Amino acid sequence: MQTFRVYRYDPLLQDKPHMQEFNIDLAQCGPMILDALIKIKATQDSTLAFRRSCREGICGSCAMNINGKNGLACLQYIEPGAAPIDIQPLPHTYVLKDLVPDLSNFYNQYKSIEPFLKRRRAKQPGEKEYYQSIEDREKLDGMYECNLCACCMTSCPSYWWNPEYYLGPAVLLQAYRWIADSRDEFTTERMAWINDSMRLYRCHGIMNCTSCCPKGLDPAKAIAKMKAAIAAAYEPGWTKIVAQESIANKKRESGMMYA
Amino acid sequence: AAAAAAGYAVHDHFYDAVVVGAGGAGLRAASGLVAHGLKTACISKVFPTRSHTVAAQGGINAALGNMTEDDWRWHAYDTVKGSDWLGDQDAIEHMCRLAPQVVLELESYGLPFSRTKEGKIYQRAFGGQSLKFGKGGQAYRCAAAADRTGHAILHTLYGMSLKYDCLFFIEYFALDLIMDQDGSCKGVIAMSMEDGSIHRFGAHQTVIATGGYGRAYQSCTSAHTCTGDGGGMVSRAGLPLQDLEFVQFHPTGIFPAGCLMTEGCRGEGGILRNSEGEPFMARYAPTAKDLASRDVVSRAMTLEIREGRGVGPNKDHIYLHLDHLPAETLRERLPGISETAKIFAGVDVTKEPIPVLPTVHYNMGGIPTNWKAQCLNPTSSDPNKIVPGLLAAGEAGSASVHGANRLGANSLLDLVVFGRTAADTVAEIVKPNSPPVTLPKDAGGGTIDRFDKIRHAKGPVSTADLRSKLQRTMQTRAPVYRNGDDLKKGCEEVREIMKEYKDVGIKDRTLVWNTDLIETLELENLITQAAQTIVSGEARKESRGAHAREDFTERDDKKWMKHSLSYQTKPHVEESDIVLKYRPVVDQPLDSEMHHVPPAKRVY
Ligand SMILES: *Cc1cc2c(cc1C)nc1c(=O)[nH]c(=O)nc-1n2C[C@H](O)[C@H](O)[C@H](O)COP(=O)(O)OP(=O)(O)OC[C@H]1O[C@@H](n2cnc3c(N)ncnc32)[C@H](O)[C@@H]1O
Numbered sequence: 001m002q003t004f005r006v007y008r009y010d011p012l013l014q015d016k017p018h019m020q021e022f023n024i025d026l027a028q029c030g031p032m033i034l035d036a037l038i039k040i041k042a043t044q045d046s047t048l049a050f051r052r053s054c055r056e057g058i059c060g061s062c063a064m065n066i067n068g069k070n071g072l073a074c075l076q077y078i079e080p081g082a083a084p085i086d087i088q089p090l091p092h093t094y095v096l097k098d099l100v101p102d103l104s105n106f107y108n109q110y111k112s113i114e115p116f117l118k119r120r121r122a123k124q125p126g127e128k129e130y131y132q133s134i135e136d137r138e139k140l141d142g143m144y145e146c147n148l149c150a151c152c153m154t155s156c157p158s159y160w161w162n163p164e165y166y167l168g169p170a171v172l173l174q175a176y177r178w179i180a181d182s183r184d185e186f187t188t189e190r191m192a193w194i195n196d197s198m199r200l201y202r203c204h205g206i207m208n209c210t211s212c213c214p215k216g217l218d219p220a221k222a223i224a225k226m227k228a229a230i231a232a233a234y235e236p237g238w239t240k241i242v243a244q245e246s247i248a249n250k251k252r253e254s255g256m257m258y259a
Numbered sequence: 260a261a262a263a264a265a266g267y268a269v270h271d272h273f274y275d276a277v278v279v280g281a282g283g284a285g286l287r288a289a290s291g292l293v294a295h296g297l298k299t300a301c302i303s304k305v306f307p308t309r310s311h312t313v314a315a316q317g318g319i320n321a322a323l324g325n326m327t328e329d330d331w332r333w334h335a336y337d338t339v340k341g342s343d344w345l346g347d348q349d350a351i352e353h354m355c356r357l358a359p360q361v362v363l364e365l366e367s368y369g370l371p372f373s374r375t376k377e378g379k380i381y382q383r384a385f386g387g388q389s390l391k392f393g394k395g396g397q398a399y400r401c402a403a404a405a406d407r408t409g410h411a412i413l414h415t416l417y418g419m420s421l422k423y424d425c426l427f428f429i430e431y432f433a434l435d436l437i438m439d440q441d442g443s444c445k446g447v448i449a450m451s452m453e454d455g456s457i458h459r460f461g462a463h464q465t466v467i468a469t470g471g472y473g474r475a476y477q478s479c480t481s482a483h484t485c486t487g488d489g490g491g492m493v494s495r496a497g498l499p500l501q502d503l504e505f506v507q508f509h510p511t512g513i514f515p516a517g518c519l520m521t522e523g524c525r526g527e528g529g530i531l532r533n534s535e536g537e538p539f540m541a542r543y544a545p546t547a548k549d550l551a552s553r554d555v556v557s558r559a560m561t562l563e564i565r566e567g568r569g570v571g572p573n574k575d576h577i578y579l580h581l582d583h584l585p586a587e588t589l590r591e592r593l594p595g596i597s598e599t600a601k602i603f604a605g606v607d608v609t610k611e612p613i614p615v616l617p618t619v620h621y622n623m624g625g626i627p628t629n630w631k632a633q634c635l636n637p638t639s640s641d642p643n644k645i646v647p648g649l650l651a652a653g654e655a656g657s658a659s660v661h662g663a664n665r666l667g668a669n670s671l672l673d674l675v676v677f678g679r680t681a682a683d684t685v686a687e688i689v690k691p692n693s694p695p696v697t698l699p700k701d702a703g704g705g706t707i708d709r710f711d712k713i714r715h716a717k718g719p720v721s722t723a724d725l726r727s728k729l730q731r732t733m734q735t736r737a738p739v740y741r742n743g744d745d746l747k748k749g750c751e752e753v754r755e756i757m758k759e760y761k762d763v764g765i766k767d768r769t770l771v772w773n774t775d776l777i778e779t780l781e782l783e784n785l786i787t788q789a790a791q792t793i794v795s796g797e798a799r800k801e802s803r804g805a806h807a808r809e810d811f812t813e814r815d816d817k818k819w820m821k822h823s824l825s826y827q828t829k830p831h832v833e834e835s836d837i838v839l840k841y842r843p844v845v846d847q848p849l850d851s852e853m854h855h856v857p858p859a860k861r862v863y
Pocket residue numbers: 279280281282283284285302303304305306307309310311312313314315316317318319409431432433434468469470471480481482484485487488489519620621652653654655667668669670671672674
C-alpha cells in the first residue's frame with residue numbers, strides 16, 4: 001500500500017496548487033509510475049490530468065518530476081517505501097492543469113533553429129540519395145534520438161532563470177545535430193545565428209541535462225562541442241551572413257524563424 | 260472570431276483545406292497542400308511529434324535496389340499476395356511505383372537513414388517480401404534508420420511542415436464533421452483543450468488523417484491516443500467504414516507489457532523457439548520460417564501455445580532468441596529493442612530470450628477510399644461513389660492497399676504516398692485562392708448539444724469501467740482464432756455496451772484539459788468501431804488474412820472476395836444499430852505497367 005502525493009491545480013477555481021495523497025495497492029498496479037497514475041484516475045479520482053501516449057518511452061509526453069528528479073513516468077519505476085512518492089509537474093513550468101505543463105515556449109524555440117535540411121542547390125532531376133558515409137552517419141548517433149521530452153530543458157538552472165532568452169539543452173543539441181549533418185550545407189549560417197550570449201553561452205555546465213535524460217543522451221557534451229567549433233571558426237563576416245539570411249526569410253509567415 | 264452557440268464561445272475559421280491529424284499521414288498532407296499554395300490548417304490532439312507514428316521501428320519499403328536488384332512491380336506482387344487478394348491492385352500499383360521517389364524525398368529533407376558502405380540507404384529484410392514475383396528469394400526493401408525509423412520520419416515530416424510554414428492547431432480535439440444537407444463535408448468542429456473554446460473550421464476539402472482504434476483491445480501495441488476518432492466522426496456522419504474485421508496481431512510483442520518487438524529482429528537473424536526448443540516456424544510457412552506473413556506467424560504461435568508447447572511458468576508465451584546474433588549487429592541495427600527489453604521485460608538480448616506473444620498492432624480497416632485518397636460513400640449502382648468534400652489518409656483510411664493483412668514496412672509507405680496523393684487531389688479540386696466555404700446555418704448545433712450533455716453527465720457507470728468491459732470483450736471474443744459462437748456472444752455484448760454509454764458519468768465539469776470528458780468522447784468512438792468490427796467479423800463466414808474463423812477455415816473467393824462496409828444507423832451510439840453492406844474489390848491495376856495478379860494460394 002504505497003502512498004503517492006500528486007500536485008493538483010484547477011485552472012478554473014485558480015486556488016493555490018496543493019499536493020493530494022492517494023493510497024494504491026502495488027499488487028494490482030503496474031511497475032511503472034504511469035501505471036499508478038492511471039490506476040488513481042480510473043478508481044479514486046478521475047479528475048487527475050496528465051499527458052501520456054506511447055507507454056514505452058518514445059513519444060516523450062509523460063515527462064514529470066518524480067521525487068525531485070525529472071523523468072518519464074512510463075520508464076520510471078515505482079520504488080516502494082514508507083516515504084510518499086511525490087509527483088509534480090515539470091519544474092518551473094506554467095501548469096495548465098494538475099500535472100500537464102505548458103511547453104509552448106519549448107516548441108517555439110525549436111522552430112527557431114529551423115530543423116530541416118538546407119542545401120544551396122535543389123536536387124537535380126535524376127538524382128538519388130545525397131551521399132553520406134557510415135562514419136558521417138555515426139556522428140549523428142547520440143543526437144537524433146531526442147524525443148523532446150523536455151526533461152533536460154526543465155532541469156537546467158539556466159533555463160529556469162532565463163527561459164525566454166536561452167534556447168536550452170534540447171534545442172541546442174538539435175542545432176548541433178544539424179550543424180554536424182554532413183548533408184547540410186548551411187553550417188556557417190547556423191553557427192553564426194547560434195553564436196549569441198543569451199542563446200548559447202548561458203550554459204554553465206551544470207550537467208543536470210545529461211543526468212536526467214530519459215533516452216541516455218548527453219546534451220552537455222554536444223553544447224561543449226558546439227562552443228568549441230564556433231570559437232575556432234568565427235570570422236568577422238558572420239554578422240553579415242546572419243543579416244543576409246534574415247533578408248531571405250522576409251516573406252515567411254508569422255512565427256519563430258531565423259532572423 | 261466570436262459567436263455564442265448554446266452558451267459556448269465558437270470561433271470560425273475559413274480555410275481551403277483542413278487536415279485532422281498530425282501523424283505521418285497528416286504532416287505529409289499538410290506540407291503538400293501548403294506547397295501547392297492552398298490555405299490550410301492541421302488539427303491534432305497532441306504535439307505532432309508525439310503521434311503513434313513515432314513508435315514505428317522497422318522501416319519503409321521501397322524498390323531502391325541499394326542492397327540487391329529490385330523492381331517496384333515485384334513489391335506490388337508481394338503486396339497483393341499479402342493482402343490475400345482483398346486489396347485494390349489499382350492503389351497498390353500507385354503506392355509501389357512511387358515508393359522509390361517518396362523515400363528519396365524524405366532523405367532530401369534530412370531523414371537520418373542508416374547507410375551502406377557506398378553511402379546509399381541501408382535496406383533490411385522483412386516478412387512477406389520476395390524477388391522475381393515470388394520465384395526469387397528474400398527481398399531487402401525496408402529502408403530503416405536503426406530501430407528508430409518512425410521517430411526519424413515523424414521528426415523529418417515535422418521539419419518539412421515547419422519549412423513550408425503549416426498552420427498547426429495543437430492540442431485541439433476534433434468532435435465531428437460539418438456535413439451539408441446535400442451530403443458534402445464542409446469542415447470539422449473541434450475543441451481546444453488549452454483554452455476550452457469550440458472552433459468551427461470550415462474548409463472546401465477535409466483530410467481525415469487520424470490513426471487506428473487499437474486501444475479497443477486489452478493488450479495492444481497501440482498508444483493510449485489510438486482511439487480511432489476520425490472513424491467515429493465518419494460513422495456519426497452516416498458514412499461507411501470498411502474491413503473493420505481485419506485486425507492484425509503482430510507476432511512478437513513483449514509479454515505481457517504489450518510493447519512491440521520489431522519484425523526486423525527476425526529479419527536480421529532472430530529465431531522463435533518453443534518449450535521443446537524447436538524453431539517451429541519451419542512447419543508453417545516452410546520457405547520463409549520466421550519471415551512469413553504476420554498473420555501466419557501469429558496463428559502458428561497461438562496454436563503452439565494451445566498445443567501445450569508454450570514457454571514460461573504458465574506455459575503462456577513463446578521465446579524470441581536473438582542471443583546467437585553478433586553483439587555489434589544487435590547494437591547497430593537493433594539499438595532500441597535491447598533497452599525496451601531490459602526495462603519492460605528485464606531481458607539481456609545478447610544472453611537471454613525475450614518473452615513474446617501475438618498482440619493487436621494495426622487495423623487494415625478504415626474509411627473507404629479510392630486511389631486518390633477521396634473517401635467513398637458507395638451506392639448499389641456506384642461502388643466507387645465519393646463523398647464530395649472528404650479525403651482520408653493513413654491507418655485511419657482504407658484504400659485497401661493492405662487488404663486482409665498488411666506487409667511489414669508498408670504502412671509508413673502508405674502514410675507518405677497517400678498523404679502526398681491527398682494533397683495533389685485537393686489541389687485539382689480547390690484552387691490556391693477560392694471564395695470562402697459557406698458553413699451551413701446549424702453548423703455544430705448537434706455536436707455542441709452532445710458535448711454539453713456529456714460534459715454534464717452524472718450516470719452510474721464510469722468511463723474507465725465501461726472501457727475495460729469493451730476491451731475485455733474484444734480481446735476474448737475476437738482473438739487470433741475466432742469462432743462463430745463467441746463472435747455471436749460478443750456481438751450481443753458490444754450492443755449492450757453501446758446502450759450502456761447512456762449511463763456514463765464524469766466528475767470533472769471544466770473545459771481546460773478535462774481528460775475525463777475527452778476520454779469519454781473517445782470511448783464513444785472506440786465503442787462504435789469495436790462494434791462494427793465484431794459485427795463484420797461474425798458476418799464474414801470465411802478465413803482470409805487476419806480474419807481466421809475456425810468454423811470456416813478456407814478462403815471463399817467466389818462469395819467473399821468483397822469489401823465489408825459497416826454503417827451506424829443513428830448519430831448517437833446508444834440509439835443505433837450496425838448495418839452491413841458490401842462493395843466489390845478493384846482487381847485491375849490502374850496502368851498496364853503492372854499486370855493483374857490472379858487470385859491464388861497464399862502458402863508463404
Ligand atoms: C502502433 C505501431 C504501428 C507501426 C509500427 C509500430 C507500432 C508499435 N511499426 C511500423 C513499421 O515498422 N513499419 C510500418 O510500415 N508501419 C508501422 N506501424 C504502422 C504505423 O506506425 C501506424 O499505422 C500509424 O498510426 C499510422 O500513422 P498515422 O499518421 O495514420 O496515425 P498516428 O501516427 O497514430 O497519428 C494520427 C494523428 O491523428 C491525431 N488525432 C487523433 N484523433 C484526433 C482528433 N479527434 N482530432 C484531431 N487529431 C486527432 C493524433 O493525435 C495523431 O497526431
